[PDB]
Design a protein around this ligand. Structure first.
Ligand code: GSH
Ligand code: GSH
Lengths: 236, 220
């Protein structure tokens, strides 16, 4: 299993799934190292945890990299995603990653952890707000999402991998009942996520896709509480 | 003005970007939009519209020559500092101020020490890789420096002056870095027009009072 590329994260989707996709889709051999949370207090102050004792981390041919956003940009540079692009075009692609990570992936995770991080919170009041913000942000991304192909043009770049996982994150939270509503509000992002799921070089990644979004002890419990709430009316 | 930064008249997501523009040899309009992807901050730079705080930081890093002569691993160390400082510290400080408006019904006495605790631990990890002299950029400041210094000011803003002594004790090199940044001559005008509130909260003053009444210095 001894790879010169190593991506380290927990056995969950949260902050790293897009990064897994970028590496698999470039047909790089890499070790998808999934560190269990029970074993993580051992890795915090070791090399796997990196300078800041947090995940994800990447090792790329001897070079250690930390933090999801920095890794994304490092990979974009390393895979040629910015070749022939001026700073303005690059910044547009980095805005997409940044928006998907900050406003969607971290927020979906916060919604799942909301009880344990905000004791006594009224889910029925708090969720519609935070969720409504989250959909509003994706709604604006959708307005600049191309009808065909990728943010990267004829080929996918980091923005594409993050945008597709932002849709899967949202779909995971809502459940399959509400696919029709998503397709109505986010048609171009939905279609892009579908295209990404069909890429042959991602077949193994889909095959080994992690089941949960965070390491929440009972995430299934939290979801059914979240899905009891009227989130569909927020979309429409 | 060919360069315009648009944000609210508050610190939150933009002060570090104001500092990067001011510290460079550059005229820019600091456009401050009354508190009343359709989101801010935005930057216009010689005809180019840029959005999202992190992407603006990286755009300026490229434009201002911050990454010249650095390999990709080096660039990514700097970019991770910006990302830690903004997403794990500055954004979370904002979250604490908005906490009971966004999480109606929350018990602050249990919630805050935990979230404030995580936030401090992150900065303490960075403290260990902060230089004793100079900047993350070496001889001159880069974006990492501006964000790191605003992360400290954010924390200080939240605690209050009483607990300054304990901060230096926990985070000497970041405290020194932030101090050094404040005395850069090129930033004097920025400090002169420095906004007085961190967020666009309806009544932040009142919210601060509530937060400081909790046992916050215990977290250090
Ligand atoms: N056509 C399907 C759902 C289509 C759909 O909504 N697909 C999007 C969600 S916006 C998606 O999940 N894409 C990933 C995939 O289907 O592979 C149905 O009849 O319910
Ligand atoms: N040491 C001074 C206080 C200055 C101070 O607060 N220094 C650090 C504490 S972390 C700081 O935040 N400096 C940033 C600044 O000068 O704006 C005093 O007590 O008279």
């Amino acid at each position: 299993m001894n790879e010169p590329i190593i991506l380290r994260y927990f056995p969950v989707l949260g902050r790293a799934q897009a990064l897994r996709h970028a590496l698999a889709d470039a047909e790089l051999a890499f070790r998808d190292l999934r560190i269990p949370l029970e074993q993580w207090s051992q890795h915090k102050d070791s090399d796997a945890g990196g300078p800041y004792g947090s995940l994800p981390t990447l090792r790329w041919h001897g070079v250690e990299v930390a933090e999801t956003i920095a890794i994304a940009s490092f990979l974009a540079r390393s895979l040629g995603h910015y070749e022939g692009r001026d700073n303005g075009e690059i910044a547009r692609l980095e805005a997409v990653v940044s928006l998907c990570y900050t406003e969607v992936s971290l927020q979906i995770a916060q919604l799942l952890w909301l009880d344990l991080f905000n004791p006594g919170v009224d889910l029925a009041a708090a969720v519609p707000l935070q969720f409504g913000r989250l959909v509003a942000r994706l709604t604006r991304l959708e307005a600049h999402t191309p009808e065909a192909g990728w943010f990267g043009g004829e080929r996918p770049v980091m923005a594409d991998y993050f945008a597709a996982e932002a849709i899967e994150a949202l779909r995971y939270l809502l459940g399959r009942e509400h696919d029709d509503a998503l397709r109505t509000r986010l048609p171009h992002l939905c279609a892009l996520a579908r295209r990404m799921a069909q890429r042959p070089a991602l077949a193994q990644a889909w095959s080994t896709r992690p089941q949960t979004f965070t390491a929440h002890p009972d995430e299934a419990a939290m979801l059914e509480r979240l899905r009891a709430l009227p989130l569909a009316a927020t979309i429409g």
